[PDB]
């Protein structure tokens, strides 16, 4: 129980860092929408807002690529690099979140917690059994000690 409770703490920390990934991603996209003047994501983003933001940032990258051609720009190159680094910033955090989901994530946490609750139940039952068995053994010892005097009696 102690060993697997330490193991459960491990996955609890995993759940904590999953919270950290989600919060960092959601706040970073909110800030990047304002930075890039990309609308529709000022508030909290669910699955669709993030997807449309990714589509729009790729569209912005393509628009910068198109604009570079008619010039053919240094500020355009800096903007393109900013878009690329923002995209990568989205990318590794999204990869972390999806990888967390791949191995099971919350399902693994639930499975770990179920075993915690179960084992706590069996130890509680075992301690109770130890109590009544201790009572019975004490009764048996008293019975023997009495039974000596009972043979005399």
Residues binding a copy of itself (CB under 8 A): 1-2, 4-15, 106, 108-109, 112-113, 115-116, 119-120, 123, 138, 141-142, 145-146, 149
The distance of closest approach from Cβ of residue 39 to a copy of itself in the complex, given in angstroms and rounded to an integer, is: 29
User: Which CB, 14 or 89, lies closer to a copy of itself?
Assistant: 14
Tokens of 122: 């069996």
Cα–Cα distance for residue pair 105/111, rounded to 1 Å: 10
The distance of closest approach from Cβ of residue 125 to a copy of itself in the complex, given in angstroms and rounded to an integer, is: 13
The distance of closest approach from Cβ of residue 1 to a copy of itself in the complex, given in angstroms and rounded to an integer, is: 6
Cα–Cα distance for residue pair 14/20, rounded to 1 Å: 10
Mark residue 16 as left, alpha or beta (left: phi above 0; alpha: psi -120 to 50; beta: remaining). alpha
Cα–Cα distance for residue pair 39/55, rounded to 1 Å: 12
User: Which CB, 8 or 54, lies closer to a copy of itself?
Assistant: 8
């Amino acid at each position: 129980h102690t060993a697997k409770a330490a193991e459960q703490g491990k996955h609890q920390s995993d759940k904590e860092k999953y919270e950290r990934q989600l919060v960092a991603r959601e706040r970073m996209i909110r800030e990047a929408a304002e930075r890039h003047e990309i609308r529709g994501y000022n508030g909290d983003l669910d699955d669709r807002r993030i997807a449309i933001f990714n589509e729009r940032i790729q569209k912005i990258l393509n628009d910068k690529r198109r604009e570079l051609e008619r010039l053919q720009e240094q500020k355009v190159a800096a903007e393109r690099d900013a878009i690329a680094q923002t995209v990568s910033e989205l990318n590794m955090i999204n990869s972390e979140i999806q990888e967390y989901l791949d191995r099971g994530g919350p399902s693994s946490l639930a499975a770990n917690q179920r075993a915690i609750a179960n084992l706590e139940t069996q130890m509680a039952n075992l301690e109770g059994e130890m109590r009544e068995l201790t009572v019975q053994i004490n009764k048996l010892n008293k019975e023997i000690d009495n039974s000596d005097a009972k043979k005399r009696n």
